[PDB]
Amino acid sequence: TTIVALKYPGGVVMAGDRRGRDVRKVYITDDYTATGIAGTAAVAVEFARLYAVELEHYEKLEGVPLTFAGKINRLAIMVRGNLAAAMQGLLALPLLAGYDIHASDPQSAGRIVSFDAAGGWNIEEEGYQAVGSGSLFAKSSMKKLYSQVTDGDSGLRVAVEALYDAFPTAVIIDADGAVDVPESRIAELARAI
């Protein structure tokens, strides 16, 4: 299913479709990252947990978190060696929303990284990216509405509208860290859309 992520002046927002089983597909992995898997929710949560362990294990052992390039690499190795998903025919390609705290400009410090099946990756320079079922519809919607993205609220508004064009859950990441968007605010926006 569809997961969108777009940059705004201040950070980055990632929103993903959902529907006592796991249902969510976008998860905060550390203080400044969030992973959104186009696929089943239980695959999305287990992938996010293993990646959360990987990032935390490094910080506890080295006394310092991985650089943002280090964070991408560890996610790329996980995609490269995902034999469990390959054997079972399950979609497990993640989209990464991150905030580089080491970037000189905090306003454009938001980051979106795409990953292919082989583990190859590319940092998005367009300021928006969509993966999943309605990715083509969500990307075209974001292209036409991206000029209206001025802050976190407008960035969340465009992200929700792109998913309707394709309630969902969302994660906002800025200088203060990654925060789960209250479901009341997304419900308010989806009704307005």
Curated annotation (Swiss-Prot):
Q: How is its activity regulated?
A: The formation of the proteasomal ATPase ARC-20S proteasome complex, likely via the docking of the C-termini of ARC into the intersubunit pockets in the alpha-rings, may trigger opening of the gate for substrate entry. Interconversion between the open-gate and close-gate conformations leads to a dynamic regulation of the 20S proteasome proteolysis activity. In vitro, chymotryptic and tryptic activities of the proteasome are both completely inhibited by epoxomicin and by the peptidyl boronate inhibitor MLN-273. Also inhibited by Mg(2+), Ca(2+) and SDS.
Q: Which EC number(s) does the record attach to this protein?
A: 3.4.25.1
Catalytic reaction equation(s): Cleavage of peptide bonds with very broad specificity
* Molecular functions (GO terms): threonine-type endopeptidase activity; zymogen binding
Name the UniProt key words of this record, in alphabetical order. Answer: Autocatalytic cleavage, Cytoplasm, Hydrolase, Phosphoprotein, Protease, Proteasome, Threonine protease, Virulence, Zymogen
Query: Per the record, what is the consequence of mutating residue 1 to A?
Result: Loss of proteasome proteolytic activity. This mutant enables optimal growth in vitro and in vivo, confers RNI resistance but is not sufficient for persistence in mice
UniProt-annotated location(s): Cytoplasm
Q: What is known of its domains?
A: In contrast to Rhodococus, the M.tuberculosis proteasome does not require the propeptide of PrcB for correct folding and assembly.
Q: What is this protein called?
A: Proteasome subunit beta
Mapped onto the parent protein, the portion here is 58 to 274 of 291
